[PDB]
Ligand binder design. Structure first.
Ligand code: W5D
Length: 167
């Protein structure tokens, strides 16, 4: 039993809910919240800027120190950093930004990072500014992640479309 409430069960391991991932993290304080990161961990907008804003910029301060030591992530890669006031840990995962020419095949590699964590609260990857179509992202998620993932999807029109179109 875990603390996640109001989710629709899609599969044995994948759950979905119309809720801001920021709002949800504050309420649940999960072990792991996933950030929709870029390779520079520059949290300017969307999931990352909203998560970072909710940490009063402490996520960005920690992230800048990480990059100064380690250099950029890979597209499809991840790192584990603090969850600050939102979660124990934040798994920063870089999905394929299609508007920068980043191979559509890399979304599966991105979701494979989730398998290193038994339970996660997560954004659909490569939605919004990444230039990808969310129905595809949910399919790859379901076909790739084997651990227990709670997808906070903050677009009802999109939530309802994802549910209604789910095979
Ligand atoms: C969950 N998913 C989020 N997505 C879903 C909406 C599609 C993306 C639009 O760019 C944010 C993307 C957000 C954003 C702020 N909070 C969130 N929580």
């Amino acid at each position: 039993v875990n603390s996640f409430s109001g989710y629709l069960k899609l599969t044995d391991n994948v759950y979905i809910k119309n809720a801001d991932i920021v709002e949800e993290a504050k309420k649940v304080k999960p072990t792991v919240v996933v950030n929709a990161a870029n390779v520079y961990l520059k949290h300017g907008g969307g999931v990352a800027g909203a998560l970072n804003k909710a940490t009063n910029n402490a996520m960005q301060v920690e992230s800048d120190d990480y990059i100064a030591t380690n250099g950029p992530l890979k597209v499809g890669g991840s790192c584990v950093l603090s969850g600050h006031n939102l979660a124990k840990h934040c798994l920063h995962v870089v999905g394929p930004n299609v508007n920068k020419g980043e191979d559509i095949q890399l979304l599966k590699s991105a979701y494979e990072n989730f398998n290193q964590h038994e339970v996660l609260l997560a954004p659909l990857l490569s939605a919004g500014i990444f230039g990808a179509d969310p129905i595809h992202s949910l399919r790859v998620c379901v076909d790739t992640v084997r651990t227990n993932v709670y997808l906070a999807v903050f677009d009802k029109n999109l939530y309802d479309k994802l549910v209604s179109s789910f095979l």
